[PDB]
Amino acid sequence: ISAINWNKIQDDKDLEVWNRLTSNFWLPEKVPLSNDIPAWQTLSAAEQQLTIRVFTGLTLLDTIQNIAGAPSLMADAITPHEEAVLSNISFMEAVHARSYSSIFSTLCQTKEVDAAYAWSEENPPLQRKAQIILAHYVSDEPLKKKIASVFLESFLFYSGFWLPMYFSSRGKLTNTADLIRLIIRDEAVHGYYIGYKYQIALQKLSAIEREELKLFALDLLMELYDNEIRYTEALYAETGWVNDVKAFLCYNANKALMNLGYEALFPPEMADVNPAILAALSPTVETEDEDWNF
Amino acid sequence: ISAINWNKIQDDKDLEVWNRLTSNFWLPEKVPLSNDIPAWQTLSAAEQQLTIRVFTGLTLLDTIQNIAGAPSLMADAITPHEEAVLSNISFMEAVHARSYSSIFSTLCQTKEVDAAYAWSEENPPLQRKAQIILAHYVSDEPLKKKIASVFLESFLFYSGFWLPMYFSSRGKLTNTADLIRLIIRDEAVHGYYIGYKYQIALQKLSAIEREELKLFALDLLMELYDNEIRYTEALYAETGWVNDVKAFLCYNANKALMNLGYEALFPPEMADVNPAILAAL
Amino acid sequence: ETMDYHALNAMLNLYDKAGHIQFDKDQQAIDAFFATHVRPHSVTFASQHERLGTLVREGYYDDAVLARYDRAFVLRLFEHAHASGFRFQTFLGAWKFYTSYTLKTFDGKRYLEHFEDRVTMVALTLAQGDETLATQLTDEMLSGRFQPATPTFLNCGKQQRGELVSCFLLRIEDNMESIGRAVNSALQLSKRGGGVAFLLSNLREAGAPIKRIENQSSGVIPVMKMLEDAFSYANQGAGAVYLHAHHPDILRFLDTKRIKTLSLGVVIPDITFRLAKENAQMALFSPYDIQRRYGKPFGDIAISERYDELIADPHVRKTYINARDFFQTLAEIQFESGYPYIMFEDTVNRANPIAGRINMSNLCSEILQVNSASRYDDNLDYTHIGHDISCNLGSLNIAHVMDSPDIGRTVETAIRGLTAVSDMSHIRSVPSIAAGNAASHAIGLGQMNLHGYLAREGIAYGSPEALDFTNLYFYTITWHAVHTSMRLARERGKTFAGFAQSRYASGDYFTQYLQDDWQPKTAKVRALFARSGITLPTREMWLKLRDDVMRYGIYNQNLQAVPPTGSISYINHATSSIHPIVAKIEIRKEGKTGRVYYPAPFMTNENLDMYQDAYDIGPEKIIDTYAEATRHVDQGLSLTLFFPDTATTRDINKAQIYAWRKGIKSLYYIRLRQL
Amino acid sequence: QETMDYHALNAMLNLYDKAGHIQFDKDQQAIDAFFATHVRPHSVTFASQHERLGTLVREGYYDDAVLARYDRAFVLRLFEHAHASGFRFQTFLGAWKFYTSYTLKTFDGKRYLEHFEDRVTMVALTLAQGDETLATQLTDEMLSGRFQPATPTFLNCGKQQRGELVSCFLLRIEDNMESIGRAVNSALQLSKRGGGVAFLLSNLREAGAPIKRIENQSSGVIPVMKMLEDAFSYANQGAGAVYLHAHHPDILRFLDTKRENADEKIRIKTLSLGVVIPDITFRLAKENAQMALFSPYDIQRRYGKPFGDIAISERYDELIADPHVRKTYINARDFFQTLAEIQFESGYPYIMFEDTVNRANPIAGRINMSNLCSEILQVNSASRYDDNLDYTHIGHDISCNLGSLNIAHVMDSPDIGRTVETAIRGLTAVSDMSHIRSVPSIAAGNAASHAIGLGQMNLHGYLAREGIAYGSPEALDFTNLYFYTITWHAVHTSMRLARERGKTFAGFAQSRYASGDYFTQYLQDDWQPKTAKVRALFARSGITLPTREMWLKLRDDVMRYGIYNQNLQAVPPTGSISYINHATSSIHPIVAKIEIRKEGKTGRVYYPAPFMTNENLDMYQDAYDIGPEKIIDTYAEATRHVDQGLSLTLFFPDTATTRDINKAQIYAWRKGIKSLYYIRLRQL
Ligand SMILES: Nc1nc2c(ncn2[C@H]2C[C@H](O)[C@@H](COP(=O)(O)OP(=O)(O)OP(=O)(O)O)O2)c(=O)[nH]1
Numbered sequence A: 001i002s003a004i005n006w007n008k009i010q011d012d013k014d015l016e017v018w019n020r021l022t023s024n025f026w027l028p029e030k031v032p033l034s035n036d037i038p039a040w041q042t043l044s045a046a047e048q049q050l051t052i053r054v055f056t057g058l059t060l061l062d063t064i065q066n067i068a069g070a071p072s073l074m075a076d077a078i079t080p081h082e083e084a085v086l087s088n089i090s091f092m093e094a095v096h097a098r099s100y101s102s103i104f105s106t107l108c109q110t111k112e113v114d115a116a117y118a119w120s121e122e123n124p125p126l127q128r129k130a131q132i133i134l135a136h137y138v139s140d141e142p143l144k145k146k147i148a149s150v151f152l153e154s155f156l157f158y159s160g161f162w163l164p165m166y167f168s169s170r171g172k173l174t175n176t177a178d179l180i181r182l183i184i185r186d187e188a189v190h191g192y193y194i195g196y197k198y199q200i201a202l203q204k205l206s207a208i209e210r211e212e213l214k215l216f217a218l219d220l221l222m223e224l225y226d227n228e229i230r231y232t233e234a235l236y237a238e239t240g241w242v243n244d245v246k247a248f249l250c251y252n253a254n255k256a257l258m259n260l261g262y263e264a265l266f267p268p269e270m271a272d273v274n275p276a277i278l279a280a281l282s283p284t285v286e287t288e289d290e291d292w293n294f
Numbered sequence B: 001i002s003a004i005n006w007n008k009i010q011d012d013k014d015l016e017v018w019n020r021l022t023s024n025f026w027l028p029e030k031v032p033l034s035n036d037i038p039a040w041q042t043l044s045a046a047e048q049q050l051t052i053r054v055f056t057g058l059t060l061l062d063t064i065q066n067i068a069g070a071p072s073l074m075a076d077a078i079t080p081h082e083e084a085v086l087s088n089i090s091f092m093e094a095v096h097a098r099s100y101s102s103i104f105s106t107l108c109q110t111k112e113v114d115a116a117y118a119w120s121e122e123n124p125p126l127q128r129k130a131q132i133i134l135a136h137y138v139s140d141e142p143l144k145k146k147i148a149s150v151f152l153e154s155f156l157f158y159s160g161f162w163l164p165m166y167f168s169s170r171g172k173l174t175n176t177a178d179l180i181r182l183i184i185r186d187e188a189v190h191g192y193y194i195g196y197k198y199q200i201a202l203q204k205l206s207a208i209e210r211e212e213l214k215l216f217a218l219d220l221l222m223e224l225y226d227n228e229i230r231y232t233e234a235l236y237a238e239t240g241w242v243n244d245v246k247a248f249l250c251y252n253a254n255k256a257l258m259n260l261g262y263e264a265l266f267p268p269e270m271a272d273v274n275p276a277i278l279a280a281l
Numbered sequence C: 001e002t003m004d005y006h007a008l009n010a011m012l013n014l015y016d017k018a019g020h021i022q023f024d025k026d027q028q029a030i031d032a033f034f035a036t037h038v039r040p041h042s043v044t045f046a047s048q049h050e051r052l053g054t055l056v057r058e059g060y061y062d063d064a065v066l067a068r069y070d071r072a073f074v075l076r077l078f079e080h081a082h083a084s085g086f087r088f089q090t091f092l093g094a095w096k097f098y099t100s101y102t103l104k105t106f107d108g109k110r111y112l113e114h115f116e117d118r119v120t121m122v123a124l125t126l127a128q129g130d131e132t133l134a135t136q137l138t139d140e141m142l143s144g145r146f147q148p149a150t151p152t153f154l155n156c157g158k159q160q161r162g163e164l165v166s167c168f169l170l171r172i173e174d175n176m177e178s179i180g181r182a183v184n185s186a187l188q189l190s191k192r193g194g195g196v197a198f199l200l201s202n203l204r205e206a207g208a209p210i211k212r213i214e215n216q217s218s219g220v221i222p223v224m225k226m227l228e229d230a231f232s233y234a235n236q237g238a239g240a241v242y243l244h245a246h247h248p249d250i251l252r253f254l255d256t257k258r259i260k261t262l263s264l265g266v267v268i269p270d271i272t273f274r275l276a277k278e279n280a281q282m283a284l285f286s287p288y289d290i291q292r293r294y295g296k297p298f299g300d301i302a303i304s305e306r307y308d309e310l311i312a313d314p315h316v317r318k319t320y321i322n323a324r325d326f327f328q329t330l331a332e333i334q335f336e337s338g339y340p341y342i343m344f345e346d347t348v349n350r351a352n353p354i355a356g357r358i359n360m361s362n363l364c365s366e367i368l369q370v371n372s373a374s375r376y377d378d379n380l381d382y383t384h385i386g387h388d389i390s391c392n393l394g395s396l397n398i399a400h401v402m403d404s405p406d407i408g409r410t411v412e413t414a415i416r417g418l419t420a421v422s423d424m425s426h427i428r429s430v431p432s433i434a435a436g437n438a439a440s441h442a443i444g445l446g447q448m449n450l451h452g453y454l455a456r457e458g459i460a461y462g463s464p465e466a467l468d469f470t471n472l473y474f475y476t477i478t479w480h481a482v483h484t485s486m487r488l489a490r491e492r493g494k495t496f497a498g499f500a501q502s503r504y505a506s507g508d509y510f511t512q513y514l515q516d517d518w519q520p521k522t523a524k525v526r527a528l529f530a531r532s533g534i535t536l537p538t539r540e541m542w543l544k545l546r547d548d549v550m551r552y553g554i555y556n557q558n559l560q561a562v563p564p565t566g567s568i569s570y571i572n573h574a575t576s577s578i579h580p581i582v583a584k585i586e587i588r589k590e591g592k593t594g595r596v597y598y599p600a601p602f603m604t605n606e607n608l609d610m611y612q613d614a615y616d617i618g619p620e621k622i623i624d625t626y627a628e629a630t631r632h633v634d635q636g637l638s639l640t641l642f643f644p645d646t647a648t649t650r651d652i653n654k655a656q657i658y659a660w661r662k663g664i665k666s667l668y669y670i671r672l673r674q675l
Numbered sequence D: 001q002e003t004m005d006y007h008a009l010n011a012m013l014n015l016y017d018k019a020g021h022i023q024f025d026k027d028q029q030a031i032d033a034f035f036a037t038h039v040r041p042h043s044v045t046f047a048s049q050h051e052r053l054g055t056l057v058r059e060g061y062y063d064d065a066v067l068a069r070y071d072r073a074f075v076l077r078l079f080e081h082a083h084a085s086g087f088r089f090q091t092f093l094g095a096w097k098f099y100t101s102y103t104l105k106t107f108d109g110k111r112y113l114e115h116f117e118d119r120v121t122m123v124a125l126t127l128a129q130g131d132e133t134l135a136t137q138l139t140d141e142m143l144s145g146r147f148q149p150a151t152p153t154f155l156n157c158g159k160q161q162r163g164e165l166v167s168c169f170l171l172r173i174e175d176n177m178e179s180i181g182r183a184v185n186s187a188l189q190l191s192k193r194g195g196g197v198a199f200l201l202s203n204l205r206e207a208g209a210p211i212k213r214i215e216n217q218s219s220g221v222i223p224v225m226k227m228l229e230d231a232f233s234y235a236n237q238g239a240g241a242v243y244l245h246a247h248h249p250d251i252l253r254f255l256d257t258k259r260e261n262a263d264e265k266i267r268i269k270t271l272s273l274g275v276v277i278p279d280i281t282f283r284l285a286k287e288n289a290q291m292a293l294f295s296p297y298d299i300q301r302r303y304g305k306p307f308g309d310i311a312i313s314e315r316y317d318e319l320i321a322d323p324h325v326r327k328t329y330i331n332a333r334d335f336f337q338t339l340a341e342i343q344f345e346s347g348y349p350y351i352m353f354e355d356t357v358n359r360a361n362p363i364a365g366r367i368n369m370s371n372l373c374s375e376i377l378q379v380n381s382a383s384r385y386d387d388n389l390d391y392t393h394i395g396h397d398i399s400c401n402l403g404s405l406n407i408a409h410v411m412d413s414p415d416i417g418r419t420v421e422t423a424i425r426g427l428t429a430v431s432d433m434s435h436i437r438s439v440p441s442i443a444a445g446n447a448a449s450h451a452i453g454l455g456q457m458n459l460h461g462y463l464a465r466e467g468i469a470y471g472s473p474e475a476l477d478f479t480n481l482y483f484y485t486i487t488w489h490a491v492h493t494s495m496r497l498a499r500e501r502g503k504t505f506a507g508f509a510q511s512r513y514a515s516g517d518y519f520t521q522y523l524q525d526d527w528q529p530k531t532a533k534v535r536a537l538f539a540r541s542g543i544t545l546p547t548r549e550m551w552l553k554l555r556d557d558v559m560r561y562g563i564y565n566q567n568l569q570a571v572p573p574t575g576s577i578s579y580i581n582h583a584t585s586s587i588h589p590i591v592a593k594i595e596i597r598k599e600g601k602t603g604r605v606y607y608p609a610p611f612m613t614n615e616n617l618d619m620y621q622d623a624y625d626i627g628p629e630k631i632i633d634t635y636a637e638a639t640r641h642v643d644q645g646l647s648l649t650l651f652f653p654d655t656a657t658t659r660d661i662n663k664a665q666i667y668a669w670r671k672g673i674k675s676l677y678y679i680r681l682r683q684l
């Protein structure tokens, strides 16, 4: 163990990723969410009850990355300056985690929150995706550790990030998504980093081992995606937006692969996202004698 | 594994530590260390050399608190929200360490940093003071971990936290001190939480066991006490204020003992220091 | 399903593939608002007969008004309104009207009025019974031309009402009586809902002696403290304090905002700039040592003119500060907390027509009038009732005015309606105001939608053809106001007191309008007035009018003033003041969702290159336009400068210099890009 | 080899010898030096009393309006005589205080123009208004030390460039903005020339009362408090007070403006606090039960009289009864609790036992509030104004003309019916000139009531002198019959006054004096000295203690001719003059054998209790060691006689408890105390 000199650096990104991920740091008490109450109320019995469940789903992921997700990727990082970034991400996930509970308190009641919490505990496809990543985390394979995480960071959050987004495209719960967008922008980075750091340990690998990794990613994605279709088919059942979420995922699946040096898989007739949703993803001195003039 | 609920919190302290520890957010780039530039030259060659050497152990200290300190305690935590605060602390400490490496670039030079750092590996009073504290992080014993965590935060750190506060009182390098103002304020809560949650752990440990650790606290804190005496005296050597820092470590190690629930060890005559250093706190 | 008007309005923040705005969803939201809120909440009446009757008997409307007309003619007029064909323009419009303006029940669950209703009521209140005039106002507010100020519109005709006009300018004198009275004056005025400004200029400096015995007085700061607390008490509820740039406290007066809810306004004389030119120092003269030696209160002497002499007089204690750094600190504080507002003493006086010297302005830098000190017995009663200033306001929709050909009628009806307000304004709580408003007939006819209109007719803002319109516009409004005012005097057989000394009486006001430059400098402009059916006043109209005044006088002291229209602009669909829009779609913190969106008037996906947002149109351009107005309007004009968050002190100071030199009467506060 | 400056001489007072014997001499030594070092090298030497007045008038120091009411012959002679009475100062502080704070100095301050006696003369002359014999009378009453016109009557008499003669004020606020407004102004125009004012908050609407039928509106009383609070911080000299019922809704938050748990947000820092507790507030504490705080709004609505104008102890159940009259509820045992917690840290609040005051009240109507020093208890009437703030109905408000008597020197003088007589005339005179221009409600109320406030001082002096341990059988019994004999004479005077003028204090026929129901308790027996020690002391002093025969002659005279003054006496604490006249504060015990004063360029000026030697130390116990008991005991006996109030400072150690204060508060109630000043804690 040697101390950190943030002056003799190994990789460019360590610093600029540290400069971003800390600039855009945020807290959930900073967003006026009490103003979404009126739009919240207008959502149906079924509609409200969904929005709760997807955030609860969002929670699980964010929680995993915090305690077992990012932590495990420290053991694989090369530059001592990467781990410092890693610790920030670890923390940040937990702020992502605090947020929903800051929503949950504000918009709904623990009569509705607790029924969605207990569903989340028992809901088969949500726990499955939580399981897939976990079995690849505690695995001793370091390259697959990153892929999994990328697939979490770049794709898994987005089966649920669609609803606070879609709403925003209707003028409902704008400020809830306003807060979500800050999560998003942090998780965008997360994907690029671990991804970039994946390609890195990858170009160092065996030429023949590079086929092994390329297939497995697609396979794992293909499984995680399979699950995700059944995950969206259950929650969003009785709304009929499935076709938009199932399209969103595809787009968000290319997003993951393109961060890992891999080429897109779903053609843009499957990743066809409505531009409105795409849009919702992001919107002293002195004087002079002279100056005095006239 | 179950998702977090910050709407059914378990301990009152959890959120208390959360709210303000997260409100106490700061960066080295927020403070203009472009200001301590004229006041920096007014130190001698050996005064300036020890500027780094004091903060160099401190760079390694937050390095070990960040990478090893909390990371082992997240299996010890009882409320999942406690796991949450520790990870901020982990992160916050990496910035603390970054803050020292913001310092060695606003005023300090290339040649000089490659001397206090390489010294921090050729320095047994530093080496051991980090070796023992970690020997309890890489021990499967939790109160050994938290005690180490306590005394690191609240005693072993304070080897070089006196230098800028003495500097600040004379108007020399205060904007650098305005930053260690933030740093300490964080370690304050860091030491406290570890401290409070040490005391929750002793509500379940049996009658004789409370003295298996009460007595074991002394063996260790005074073991790393004399290794700190060594580190203090060859650093504050030809300065003259070796004995004001002598009174400094008997002050905050009485606050370190306080940061566990125990009673303060050193009397009126050993814990009383410079009243102009504490005013600039 | 589900498209609540509030989610529907929100759709104005979103786009299509070419770069579109969804105006569609606004007018759609209005249609929604009337059917999700308004008509399910209003109460139905068989005929206006019950409507009038029940609303009188139940204690909502006031009979004191109607009884002045044949009850026949009231339902005659009401029908005329509800058949005028009024629909709404913006979502915010109808939102603002209904929530804030319209008459709802005592418990507040049902609506009792609609837009066309509120007009009728005001039209009947202002006309005092004049059948022929009651009609005219109804038409003029309904067609959207004349628009009474927030308090007037709101309150008229209601029995359970507040005050007709908020906005007051009362000076404090250098004695404990007047200070006291003023601290009370706040209490009685702020509780009725008033916006009061105070003239601190007169009071003793810090370190001044009281009762012959030396170094005693507290300064101007602690008098504020009390006023602040008084405003803090009486809620709605906001105040401003004006100080002369050459009062010895100025820096520690500026320092208070470096004392939360007060507004600072600094009167800067020409000599301050002149000192600020050659990097010199300033002189701050003791208000005490002026009183003794020159027998006049500080705020009442020509600081610019005397200056040399003052500095020479050894009895007057001079305090020295930095001119360059003054303008600096001024900027510094504006950067942060908005004010200090500025008004340029001499600039104002120079082109003031009324006898005397103005010293201060209102809460919005727009009202600029002369006043006289009031003298009190020890029991706080008036031994001499002075004159202080109250501001009756109302504005015109530049565009809507330009459409109808009888711009004259459009103006008279408005000036008369405005005048009617003073003849009904009896603030008994502070007599100087009331007795001043009893001799002055002070009014302030405003404008709005200039930007809307220019950009509607296609003109870019700040352009050589823009200024050219806005100049020859005000020119022609002015003529009609003065005419309306001259006529009024002829009918009442009385001029405002102090007229015999006015420049209107001397005829040196008419001097300007008897020369030229008064023919269009651009062909595009001339087209507008040709096309609009507006006869630009010709030399022998002024020449006929000069000699008319110089016989019968004018009944009003000050005629126009252009305010920074608050909510009234959003009811009448107008681009704020006579300045550019703050943005293409104004985001405003209101009601349930915390924000309501406002699209600029006459805006489509086609003319989007006209609606350049203020911030980046630039400072200079705004002044440039305002200059042309400052030319004609006798009072001040509320000038808000719009800088980018990256701009620096210089920029501001530089912009103020220009503004000063261009001859701006008054400056409001400076806004930075950050939302 | 030299050294000893008169200040160093006065500090010696605090230094003992071996065992401990006070250097009483080193203060008297200081006096001699004080004059030798500072006073006389700084006086203006006037070749004859003839050029003096001639120089002091022309140069615009002395008020020619006064002197020209007598032939200069008499004036010169009176002066000459005043100086021939041979006055000598007693203690250092005594002298020092006079010159620095009271005596006449040249415009530039740098020289002195008057000596003690000179002041007296002027005072004596100003108060006589033109009466040769009364002027001579006053001269002697003051210089002997029997009379002392309170600070503001002393310091500001005779001088041409002068401030007001009275400096204590009681103003009321009515539940409407006009009075709200007029209150801040009066807080201004009164405090501006060093006038202490008290305000009546009891009447204002509560912390959420609707305005003009529109629900939940009004701000409370706090914001009006704050306005005044700062308004006093401007007019600086400048001490303000406020009074609010125990059963007025805001009471718990009102008590919480002083609480440390604030700063800006619910905080007042200069204003003094007064709390009115009616009798029932005790009954509710008894059975642990809750207090019912009523709406002043809803009371004004239903009943037609504003809050503090109607009964609260006597109408309590009848007010819970009315369901139209709103009701908030809190603990009575916790109200009294908080009081002590506020009392501990802040000193306040004061206390006025509403009914104990109204039952002893001999005057028409009700008393609703008290003054900054809890010692004024008079009846006011509200005022009505136009919207322009012009007065429409100029109601009565209270100004306090105060004076004092040295108990010891009074018992020394032969005639006491002269000692008191003179005192009353001068006071009356003060109140016959108090044309307070700025608040006509105080001026024309004063011009109606002719109310005066004669005090008593040097009790723990006279007691200690004559070998009486404070609060002993001998003490109590004496002071009982002392306040007794003073009372009679005070009235007899007021009766004679009402006879010289042919008029009474307006609305006499409604007073208990006019029916004779005042003379009730003075005509049932009990007025024999409980101790022969006390009897032989009244003999020694030669005082005709008022007979049952006297109490008839007076009765029959009063009923016939009337009395010129609504109120004759009130006993304030002496904080300034009790050093000029050498008196043991009020009638309460001394503060320490040698009191320390934070004045002058030492930071410490020390003051030794009168008549105190190295022999009679056991008679001079500091009020702390006495015990709030004996103090209340002595105060009760006084309160029996005095028509107005007696300002009661209670004295506690640092070991005292939240209950210890609460406990005394009750012993004060039970024994029949009218009012309470604040409670002190032992630390310096
Ligand atoms: N803070 C404070 N300000 C005062 C006081 N007296 C006067 N001032 C201030 C407020 C007024 O603006 C200014 C003049 O007030 P006045 O007319 O009450 O003073 P006065 O006539 O007693 O003496 P003057 O002839 O004005 O020097 O001085 C005071 O006692 N305290």
Ligand SMILES: Nc1nc2c(ncn2[C@H]2C[C@H](O)[C@@H](COP(=O)(O)OP(=O)(O)OP(=O)(O)O)O2)c(=O)[nH]1
Binding pocket: C190, C191, C192, C233, C234, C235, D174, D175, D176, D177, D178, D180, D204, D205, D210, D211, D212, D213, D217, D218, D219
């Ligand atoms: N916070 C606040 N309190 C006010 C205001 N106006 C009056 N108050 C308070 C102070 C007075 O104690 C009480 C009654 O005030 P007024 O007698 O001037 O009200 P007014 O006679 O116009 O109608 P009202 O007596 O309420 O039926 O309410 C205000 O604008 N704001």
Ligand SMILES: [Fe+3]
Binding pocket: A062, A065, A092, A093, A096, A183, A187
């Ligand atoms: Fe996350």
Ligand SMILES: [Fe+3]
Binding pocket: A065, A093, A153, A186, A187, A190
């Ligand atoms: Fe992430």
Ligand SMILES: [Fe+3]
Binding pocket: B062, B065, B092, B093, B096, B097, B187
């Ligand atoms: Fe740290």
Ligand SMILES: [Fe+3]
Binding pocket: B065, B089, B093, B153, B186, B187, B190, B191
């Ligand atoms: Fe730490």
Ligand SMILES: [Mg+2]
Binding pocket: C174, C175, C176
């Ligand atoms: Mg004056």
Ligand SMILES: [Mg+2]
Binding pocket: D175, D176, D177
């Ligand atoms: Mg009222």
